[PDB]
Amino acid sequence: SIAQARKLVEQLKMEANIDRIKVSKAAADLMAYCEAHAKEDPLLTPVPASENPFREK
Amino acid sequence: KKILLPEPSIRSVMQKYLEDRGEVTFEKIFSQKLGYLLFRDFCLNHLEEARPLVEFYEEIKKYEKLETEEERVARSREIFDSYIMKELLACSHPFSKSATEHVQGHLGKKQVPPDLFQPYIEEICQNLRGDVFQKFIESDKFTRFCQWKNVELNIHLTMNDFSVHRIIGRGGFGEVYGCRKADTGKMYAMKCLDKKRIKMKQGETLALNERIMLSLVSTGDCPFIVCMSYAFHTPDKLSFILDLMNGGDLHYHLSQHGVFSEADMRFYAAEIILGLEHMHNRFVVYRDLKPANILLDEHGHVRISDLGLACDFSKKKPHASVGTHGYMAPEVLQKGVAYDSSADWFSLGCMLFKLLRGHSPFRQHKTKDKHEIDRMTLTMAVELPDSFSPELRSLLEGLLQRDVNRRLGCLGRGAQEVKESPFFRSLDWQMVFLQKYPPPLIPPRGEVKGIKLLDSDQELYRNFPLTISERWQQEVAETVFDTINAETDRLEARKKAKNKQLGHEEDYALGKDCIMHGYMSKMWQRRYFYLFPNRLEWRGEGEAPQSLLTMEEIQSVEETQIKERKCLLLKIRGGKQFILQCDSDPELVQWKKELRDAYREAQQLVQRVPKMKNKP
């Protein structure tokens, strides 16, 4: 009844008490990751049939 | 024309069919002749924790059938100091002290009634019901039982199933024939009525009543009644399959042999009495007891024939005036008169009198009126010609009373009172039942359209087809049962060894959640189906199922008619439809049930599942 209600606020306090970074920071890190691995993505840049296991290997 | 048992896979369908009707119990299977035969087979050959119990049970059954006390005195001792005895009382489950004390009590005092070891019987069953019976259900003997039960529950007789021979009697509606059933070879009598002349003379009231009375009577294997085994009909014929009696009736033999003596009459009367006690115990009145309805067999023994005019007084007493004149009791003849089995004890006296004199005791001087005998039955009291004996009179005096309150067999004990008459003092009724007495007369061998049927009249004979389970199983047991099992056994081992070579060897219906499986035909193509909680898979021979039908894909399951054959019609979502055809009626019933339960349950379930159900 109230033991669960007591349970809820304790959870919210644990979720409220966290360090948050700026979205500008987090968004840049994501973009930086994509750029640093764009060359390793076969779905992004279609690879030669020689290196494609589903075409000619 | 030979009997072909369905493959053991029929168990999957049959077991669910029987359990639905609660037919899968120890008592219900044990009570059946084929059921018992297969059960004893399993117990005597594939389970020794019950072998000695079955051996002892059969020894008691042999003992029960011994006639003379001379035999039972010796056998009772042999059975007691038998060492099947101290093989049971010297092992897992011995007989109770209270049971043994009763047996050795009667056995010691030198009285050996046929029901001597009855206390042992019940304790044996109390030991067979349960764990032992559960092991039987799991055995392949119950599987074979399902194979036989499938054949029985799928009996559809036609004139092609019988080899009809010479005529052996005629009636107002049809004829009687000597025939031989094709699959077993059992000699039967085929009473073929004709709906044309039936509807004409207003006879379906009798044709139906005879079929119902035969049902109430054709149980117990009574040696003194022409009992029915099967009942079926063609487009124009009503057919009863009855006991074969190719010896003519008594009215024929009476007029050709002359009047019978008291000794010759005592024979027929004795057998006729047992035939009456049979019906009366099953609350059935014959009402039409006359010399013409008494058939003789090849050996001269007799049976009561034509139950067309019989009645049931189990819950509702009869009243109307029915029967042949001169043989009708005052009670019945009196209408509005609740009159029961007391009407046959009167007809017996009238009939026996005609065997002695040559006519009814109320039809004097060739009179041909029909108020006729009704005057003398109610008013006058028939008074013997003193040619009879003091005992013969003492019988007919009691049988031909007008008072049911003072008539022989109507003052509490029924037939037991008639058997007790001084006229039958010389007879052993046990040996009368066994037909041990010599018949007085042994029959010489080899002698003795502008109407339309509407469908509504054909709807009177809707539930006419019937099959006495006791009769059919008995017929099978005493003919083809053992040999058919032998062939079927090796034919199944043959398929198994072949599947060994080919390599599988592993059942598709095991280790899963399969609900049921078996053969069906789609559209025709015959495939093996597997019913799961969410789909219906099927396959041909030579590979596991490549096709199926999801339960969610099924809309309805309706029974439809095609070529006079019942089929299951499956309506599928895409406006399509799927039609199935079962090999037997039991399979049609179970598949329609299991399929309806399956798709309704599945669709009910899928709707509650986010990932499974259909979204906008």
């Binding site: 979205v23 994509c34 764009a38 993505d41 779905l43 | 599942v609 990932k611 499974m612």
Partner: protein, 339 residues
């Protein structure tokens, strides 16, 4: 009362959490990525068609070798394929016909699955002597098993319709940790790269970040207006995507503790059933109930391409670890390898 402020106090933290998140919303992912070139039109072709399942396909999961993949179907079977040859390595009839999910152990030694039977079954592939049989039946959930993922050969995480998730010790066969918090059926879950965290998506329209060891909920993400059917981690593990019945995918960043972007189009009205990133995380592939698989620009939120090769719902998909191909499972009983 004493339930007086415990509901008011609870509301205030929700305001503060929302306030703390707004304080971090200094810019958008869309604004940050306006300088990088678009991925252009993404176009793939079917390299393989896996035929075998007799009914609907509900789930699939790639092996770590980017060659073997397992799939669960309505026909009550698990099939382990060789995507290169399309040959079947294993066909595993299940004890229950109501399977909804399946998983492939990173070692390749085991595959797991479950459904309406409310249990997660572990299957040993490299066997005792030759065959393939049930090695463990994880019982505990009071609801159906919606998803499961191997941490290793003796640890697996599961989500259920019983509202909860759970960490299992396969050897002992009991639940090491229970993750309670959701208020609706948990539909999917995804393991972080470090396998020290994992996110879940339930029918309460919320995703939760869990600590595997401490067994606690660390962060809660909302925004969706309906059931979350699928969820997946971004390659670096600092973010994850979600698929909902609201016809929208969404990107959530952990360190920012909020949503970064929404992937949708006015033409797309059907629900998402599965989500997955390309190797670089630049592409967000999602399966839809309109028989299609839309490819989204994860950074710019544009629809780059569309995989249209099924005649029924795309119920699942997955990108290989080497990023060489995408597999799509459908209600048409077919799996296709796109490239």
């Amino acid at each position: 009362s004493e339930l007086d402020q415990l509901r008011q106090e609870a509301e205030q933290l929700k305001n503060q959490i929302r306030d703390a998140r707004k304080a971090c919303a200094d810019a958008t992912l869309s604004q940050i990525t306006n300088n990088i070139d678009p991925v252009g039109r993404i176009q793939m072709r079917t390299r393989r068609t896996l035929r075998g399942h007799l009914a609907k396909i509900y789930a699939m999961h790639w092996g770590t070798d980017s060659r073997l993949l397992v799939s669960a179907s309505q026909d009550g079977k698990l099939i382990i394929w060789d995507s290169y040859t399309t040959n079947k390595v294993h066909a595993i009839p299940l004890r229950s016909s109501w399977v909804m999910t399946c998983a492939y152990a990173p070692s390749g030694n085991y595959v797991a699955c479950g459904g309406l039977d409310n249990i997660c079954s572990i299957y040993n592939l490299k066997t005792r002597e030759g065959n393939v049989r049930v090695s463990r039946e994880l019982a505990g959930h009071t609801g159906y098993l919606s998803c499961c993922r191997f941490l290793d050969d003796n640890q697996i995480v599961t989500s259920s319709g019983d509202t909860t998730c759970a960490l299992w010790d396969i050897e002992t066969g009991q639940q090491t940790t229970t993750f309670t918090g959701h208020t609706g059926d948990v539909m999917s879950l995804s393991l972080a790269p470090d396998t020290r965290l994992f996110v879940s998506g339930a029918c309460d329209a919320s995703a939760k970040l869990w600590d595997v060891r401490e067994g606690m909920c660390r962060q809660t993400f909302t925004g969706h207006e309906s059931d979350i059917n699928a969820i997946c981690f971004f390659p670096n593990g600092n973010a994850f995507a979600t698929g909902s019945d609201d016809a929208t995918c969404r990107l959530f960043d952990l360190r920012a503790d909020q949503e970064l972007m929404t992937y949708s189009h006015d033409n797309i009205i059907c629900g998402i059933t599965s989500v997955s990133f390309s190797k670089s995380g630049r592409l967000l592939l999602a399966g839809y109930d309109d028989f299609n698989c839309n490819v989204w620009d994860a950074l710019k939120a544009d629809r780059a391409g569309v995989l249209a090769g099924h005649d029924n719902r795309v119920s699942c998909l997955g990108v290989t670890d080497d990023g060489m191909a995408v597999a799509t499972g459908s209600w048409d009983s077919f799996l296709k390898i796109w490239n």
